Amino acid sequence: GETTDGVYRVMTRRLLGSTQVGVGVMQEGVFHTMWHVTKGAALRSGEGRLDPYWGDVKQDLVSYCGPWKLDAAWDGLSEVQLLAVPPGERAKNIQTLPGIFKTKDGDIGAVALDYPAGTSGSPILDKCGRVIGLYGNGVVIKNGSYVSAITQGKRE
Amino acid sequence: DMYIERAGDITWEKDAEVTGNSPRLDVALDESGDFSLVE
Numbered sequence: 532g533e534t535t536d537g538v539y540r541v542m543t544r545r546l547l548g549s550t551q552v553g554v555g556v557m558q559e560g561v562f563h564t565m566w567h568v569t570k571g572a573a574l575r576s577g578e579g580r581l582d583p584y585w586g587d588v589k590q591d592l593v594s595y596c597g598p599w600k601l602d603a604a605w606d607g608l609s610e611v612q613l614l615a616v617p618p619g620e621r622a623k624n625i626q627t628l629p630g631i632f633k634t635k636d637g638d639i640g641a642v643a644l645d646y647p648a649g650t651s652g653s654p655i656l657d658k659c660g661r662v663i664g665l666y667g668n669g670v671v672i673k674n675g676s677y678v679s680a681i682t683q684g685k686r687e
Numbered sequence: 688d689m690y691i692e693r694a695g696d697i698t699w700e701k702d703a704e705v706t707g708n709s710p711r712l713d714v715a716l717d718e719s720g721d722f723s724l725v726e
């Protein structure tokens with residue numbers, strides 16, 4: 532299987548044609564995506580197979596082949612880049628200044644960019660190219676646009 | 688059965704398209720991992 536670092540599309544042939552259900556990050560031999568993309572199911576990579584290693588429905592994250600490796604955090608001041616990988620379209624970097632989700636358990640960074648549901652799992656990066664979280668879990672505000680959290684896991 | 692296809696490198700792009708606002712939202716997170724607007 533292809534295990535080179537980079538961003539990957541999560542595809543399925545169960546529905547009509549081939550459908551992109553999400554996106555993920557390959558880093559240090561571990562595939563990282565959002566839980567609602569795969570529902571914890573096994574993935575295929577050419578001839579190889581990736582099996583789930585860690586997952587949590589509340590965090591909305593899952594890792595394949597090993598533990599969660601991404602641990603960079605948003606600094607709270609700087610602009611970031613959503614490396615959006617939309618269905619049927621080429622990967623493109625969109626720069627934005629994140630907002631804030633104020634919760635009872637603290638504040639989380641949030642990106643106000645609207646992309647198809649099949650873009651879930653696309654990495655959000657800092658100026659160094661480090662993945663500070665994944666896109667695809669948030670809320671819908673008054674005007675109808677999407678505001679996603681910058682969802683980051685924990686590195687053991 | 689799901690499968691993965693490489694889509695690119697993870698790199699910061701200088702002079703990328705700068706868009707999107709920065710809203711400060713009061714949200715709640717339930718046990719199913721779903722966010723909702725607290726109002």
Ligand SMILES: CC(=O)Nc1cccc(C(=O)Nc2ccc3c(c2)CNC3)n1
Nearest residue numbers: 567591646647648651667668677720721
């Ligand atoms: C217009 C619009 O809605 N767009 C986008 C864009 C990205 C994601 C989603 C979405 O629906 N995310 C999602 C679905 C299921 C679950 C969770 C997040 C966490 N619990 C399960 N929508």
